[PDB]
Design a protein around this ligand. Sequence first.
Ligand code: SF4
Ligand code: SF4
Ligand code: FES
Ligand code: MG
Ligand code: ZN
Lengths: 125, 86, 690, 208, 48, 96, 115
Amino acid sequence: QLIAVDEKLDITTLTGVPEEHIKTRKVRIFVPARNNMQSGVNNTKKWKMEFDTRERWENPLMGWSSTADPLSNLVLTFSTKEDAVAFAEKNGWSFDVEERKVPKPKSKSYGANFSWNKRTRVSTK
Amino acid sequence: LGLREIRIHLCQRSPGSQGVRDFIEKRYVELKKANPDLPILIRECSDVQPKLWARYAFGQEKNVSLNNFSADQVTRTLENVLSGKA
Amino acid sequence: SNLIEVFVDGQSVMVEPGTTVLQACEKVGMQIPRFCYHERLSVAGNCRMCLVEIEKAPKVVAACAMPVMKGWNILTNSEKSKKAREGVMEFLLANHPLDCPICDQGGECDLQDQSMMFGSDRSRFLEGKRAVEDKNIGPLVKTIMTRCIQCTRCIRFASEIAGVDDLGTTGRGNDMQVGTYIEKMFMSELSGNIIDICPVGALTSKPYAFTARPWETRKTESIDVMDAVGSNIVVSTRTGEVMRILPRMHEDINEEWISDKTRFAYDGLKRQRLTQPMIRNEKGLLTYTTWEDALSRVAGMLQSFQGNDVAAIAGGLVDAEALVALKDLLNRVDSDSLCTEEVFPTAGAGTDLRSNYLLNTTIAGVEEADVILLVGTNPRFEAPLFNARIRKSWLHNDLKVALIGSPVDLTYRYDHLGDSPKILQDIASGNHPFSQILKEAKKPMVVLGSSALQRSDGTAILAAVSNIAQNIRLSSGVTGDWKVMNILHRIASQVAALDLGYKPGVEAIRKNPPKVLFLLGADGGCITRQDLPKDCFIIYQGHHGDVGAPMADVILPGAAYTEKSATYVNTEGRAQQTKVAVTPPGLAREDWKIIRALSEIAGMTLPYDTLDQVRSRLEEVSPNLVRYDDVEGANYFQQANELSKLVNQQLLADPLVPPQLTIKDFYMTDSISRASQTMAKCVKAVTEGI
Amino acid sequence: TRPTIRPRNDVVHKQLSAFGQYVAEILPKYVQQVQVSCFNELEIFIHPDGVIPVLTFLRDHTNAQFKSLADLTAVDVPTRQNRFEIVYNLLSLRFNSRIRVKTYTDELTPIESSVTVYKAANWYEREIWDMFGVFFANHPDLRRILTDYGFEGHPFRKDFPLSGYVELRYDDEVKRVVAEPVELAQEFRKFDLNSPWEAFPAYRQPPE
Amino acid sequence: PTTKPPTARKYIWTNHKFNVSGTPQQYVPYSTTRKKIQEWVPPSTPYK
Amino acid sequence: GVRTSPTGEKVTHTGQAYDDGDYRRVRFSDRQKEVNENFAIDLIAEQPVSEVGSRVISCDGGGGALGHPRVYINLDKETKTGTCGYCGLQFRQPHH
Amino acid sequence: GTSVKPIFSRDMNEAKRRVRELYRAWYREVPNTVHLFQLDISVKQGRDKVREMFMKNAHVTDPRVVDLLVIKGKMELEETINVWKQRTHIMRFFHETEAPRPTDFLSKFYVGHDP
Ligand code: SF4
Ligand code: SF4
Ligand code: FES
Ligand SMILES: [Mg+2]
Ligand SMILES: [Zn+2]
């Protein structure tokens, strides 16, 4: 037999996260943009969740890069935007969602390179 | 008591902003020609509600809902704000 | 409809006529291997990597150039296609140099990845390799032509997108070489994109050379502020340091291109930086101090004076959050002297109607226009991506382009009506043939540059251009919802400041010299201390040491656009927000945080404490500033025109001359690019060739 | 094929498919899917209510005789409504075969304890609770097994940071070891290794 | 190394040194790179 | 090619020396600063340019498989010598 | 209906009763913890800390979350009673070596960039 709870899901008290990293964090939900250096598009299929960037400073010894926020490397992968939104809500994180950008279909025509009167005619191959 | 600026936030195609759209289309020109040195900012809202903002001296500002108002009611509200009322 | 039916590995696909095999394959989620094909360039068909087998066809076809026929079954993973890919990759790698450890392309090389995915794992080439000599094409693009695979992507981009026909091929056979055949520099505002389009490390970024590898860089998607275009960019950071700037694809703004100032001026963020608060000592010299002391001095001077005696000037790189913060701070003093350096005519509707100072047609709307008239602007150097879109629609839609102003080179051919401003009156009255040309156009476009508005007779020019637009509206009838009036801005902060109620221009400060002046990133030299009374208190809040800083009494170090999550408004009117890539250096702080702390120190605390509350305040002032991709807005051209007919200020007998006439004036236009050594190298190269 | 390619075994494939059909027929109330992988591993997907009956049947049936529990673990997939995938690995010594039973749960739905079926499940369930936060009902003694005393959070969840939230050091003023928020002299460097080109067309998903 | 001497190089140490830990010759680590961010230098002259 | 700063600190091959007002100097007190004295740029600058009679030369760094990946260098320009991107050796065609 | 399986309690009242029982057990245990671990705090401090930890989760309205919190509290109490915890673990509840971080806007602005 079931109990029929009627409140929205909240698991913040069970995750062991400090209060600072629940109420002051901002997560971004987005599909990563294609690396413009390459033409492959396999890295633009899923949704990502990442946290806001915090301070990094030089270590007095070795001049290394130091950090104090534990979430600086946490990246989650989701199959849909709604799954990421639900995860963020049940974890109590304030989120910003960016709509997926898809390149528009384009009209390519090899014969247009050699037009009789149009400007699309190419001067070299 | 010194009026500094007027802000009118009307949504572009919501039903509740039809009166504000009519007012801006018809009498905004004469309203601006009556007050050549008064900033009357016309900005667009998302579908929540229409509103009007009046800013007074020292950063005090007041807001009033213009939702479902007609052009005549918008004119009444603006002439009340522009004069020594409320 | 007109769609035909094709199959990709036996799966039905409905495509438009003229669709290529590659596009049909990508409709079902497969990417055909490619080297020479770029969807924004013309089809070349030379690399032959995209060869694919069609069922019941003995010979493989080039998927990038071949339109797909109805009933075709594309077999993308058959033995024929795989062996063709392996053979093509073998031929590509036969002469390629073993330069991967020293090549900057390593780790993000299409040749490497497609060899790993579609090629074999070993070599059977037992001969010697070919080596070619390098070409010097400028201080921006590093050239190692032995890595060239002869794709010709760079040549097509130079010819079609950049409008420069300086690149080509010389020789033939194995000896064919890509270059200029002479010592010549490929110096263009869009020249840096050939590095991105090049699949291999033949063309690489010279400022970025050897510094980092692709896998260690962290990607921060942000917005460019070097102009009013608002190009989407990616900031590459490693270990808390900005490494390079890459374009981010936005179809409606910049596609996948950025200007050279956008790409190579990031190194100016590492020089002449304000890191600590500064005050004046007893010798009149600037001395380091804590935030407490500087804020206390500023708060004391703020409490001492009131009203008209307090003023603020906003610079070209100011975000909306700091703008509204400073506006609220001076409003609590009962001061309305919130001004920008860029001048916009206040006569008539002025800033009241948002469409009066916007690119109403939008950047993507340029592709629909039949005729465009440019008045007093050099779009090539004022908005490089807007000019690129103009050339794109000129090439692909036979767009008719005219110009009023100095006859500058726009990388496309146009009709030069002249530089005298009376041509506007002649066109409006109908005494000009271009009046009829505009009358008979289906989608006319008129663009007035904000640089021409920086004249004493700017209001007259705006009135004349609005009269031309009104004549077009009345004569050609109503096209539906098509906007003819457009304002092209060059300053990233201008539209956001105008949306908030800032007074355009700095006339209000000359009308009433203030005792206390806030320089919020103002580095244009609009007002020096000669325009101000003695003992004037000048406060400069910014991130660089530029002309504004040394005449201030208190210096408040702020954050650069790469160091804050901040909102900027586009020339189109589209609000966009940046992200934090690194944090401000030293003691520098977020700008709105500085203003809020100052307000609290002075006792007139602002109601907001967090960035979400700052954006809620922005929504309270102007709701369009929290719609982060909306570009839609109401059209109020009729009211603005009627209000602009009220005053009849006269034109001057001065030919319209844009501030930028040649490439040398393009590189250094703001505080960040003036501190950039790469921009200095660019100016040195364009000034004398050598 | 030959020298470099792993050979196939069709006989084991058919045997495992037949036994999966057998098990699915015997327990239609709980079995949702049966899969055989190409390297001959049998997987049975069940409803969470069937954890005890299915495991009991696989242990005690004459034709199954899966008397050994090889392993029991959990997998965290944040994108699913039911976050946690519970995996049982069983071995049959009578028939020289292995089987995998899989179910699901979320953060708040308990799973039945299997200590009555397999005594080995005690510490495995304790570790699942410690690392993932999945509660097991009727567990004789459920408590942390791997983490420090008083440790907050479940480290093996995908959203738990790799370095955690607190670090330890000795403090001389209080003369004891204290816990403080983590600061790293060198931050772990995140690498983006995935190629933008697809590797395996046989696993391509529909473009939605 | 008498019958098979090592290969002579101009950069090879001619004098071997033992473990120098605990001595004033001990290795002290330090960052080997240059300063990354350059600060603006205020003018040295009065401004009025 | 070691060089000393106006403070007396040896400048390394990477050019890093602490500013006279830098507190991080204190780590070298009662101790030393480790500096390698064989500057590679000067060492490679001493190597003579090899004269070869072909338009393209091959370099693997010497030692066969004990060097670097084998690359081919074009030598058509008489204005400048052909430098190996791995080893730094220089090659040129006979002129004068 | 939302069709959710319970853990222990049907609704919030039984969850509250379990919370009260756990609070009673902790309140009884505190003096024994002070004696056994040789803590320098007083019994009042320990009971105030227990009250603070209980009130930390006062906003929870989901009975399943309350049940899981009670389960975790019982685990912590079982660790404390059996002396599986050491003095360091008990004193970690007090954060005696962490500096008090200010909350006002001006102090955060002065110290750094964190909101
Ligand atoms: S271009 Fe690509 S394949 Fe050629 S050397 Fe550079 S990284 Fe290697
Ligand atoms: S330089 Fe790059 S883009 Fe140009 S032909 Fe060579 S490989 Fe192609
Ligand atoms: S991609 Fe088609 S031949 Fe190059
Ligand atoms: Mg390249
Ligand atoms: Zn070499």
